[PDB]
């Protein structure tokens, strides 16, 4: 709409503020250690990041 | 002295319009009064200068009238204003502690006050449902069946 309601709703906090840095999804995010990544996306890129599986 | 029961021992009392057992501890006796809890009983007895280790039956008539007048008039007796019930009244605004059938009708007075403006809380009260917004899906069944 006109420039004063298209994005008018405040999104400084909450699930709406945060999205997966890979797939732009808002569910199952991992904000720990500054990942900001999807629950499913992290499993995909865990090896590349460095998160290996010991036990 | 853990002696024979005192001759002027009242097994129950008659304070306000409720009877309280005299065989139990004084701070845990006046808790039988509506509007008086464990906390409020201790502060009033603390400020009425009565012994804490003695039971309700062995309090004397003058001590039981000192106890009542503390409870009725707590503001004048240095009991703080954060330790009462009807603080900042919705009708008259004065801070007070209500202790009897006055508590039952103040609850009814505020209960009809919500109904008369038919606010949501009054409607929930009138319909007999929860008013604090909790889930009615799987609880509170006993009151209905």
């Amino acid at each position: 709409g006109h420039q004063q309601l298209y994005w008018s709703h405040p999104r400084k906090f909450g699930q709406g503020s945060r999205s997966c840095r890979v797939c732009s999804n808002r569910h199952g995010l991992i904000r720990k250690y500054g990942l900001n990544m999807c629950r499913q996306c992290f499993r995909q890129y865990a090896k590349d990041i460095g998160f290996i599986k010991l036990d | 002295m853990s002696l024979v029961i005192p001759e002027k021992f009242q097994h129950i009392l008659r304070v306000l319009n409720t009877n309280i057992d005299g065989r139990r501890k004084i701070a845990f006796a006046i808790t039988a009064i509506k509007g008086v809890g464990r906390r409020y009983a201790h502060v009033v007895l603390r400020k009425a200068d009565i012994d804490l280790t003695k039971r309700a039956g062995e309090l004397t008539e003058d001590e039981v009238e000192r106890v009542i007048t503390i409870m009725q008039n707590p503001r004048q007796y240095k009991i703080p204003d954060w330790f009462l019930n009807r603080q900042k009244d919705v009708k008259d605004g004065k801070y007070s502690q209500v202790l009897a059938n006055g508590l039952d009708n103040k609850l009814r007075e505020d209960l009809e006050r919500l109904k008369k403006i038919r606010a949501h809380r009054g409607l929930r009260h009138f319909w007999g449902l929860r008013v604090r917004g909790q889930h009615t899906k799987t609880t509170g069944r006993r009151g209905r069946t």
Partner: protein, 57 residues
Amino acid sequence: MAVQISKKRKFVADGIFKAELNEFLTRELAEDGYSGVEVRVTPTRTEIIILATRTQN
């Protein structure tokens, strides 16, 4: 100090950068035989090595 990010967040960031860089190169150099990426990052300047079968491409 305050400006520097913590080692825990820092080492996660480098893994994020490598994963993001690998994904971008995987999509782009796919038909060129992109095999992998090696990142020899140094405090002065970083450097990126692309491992591909068909280098002249």
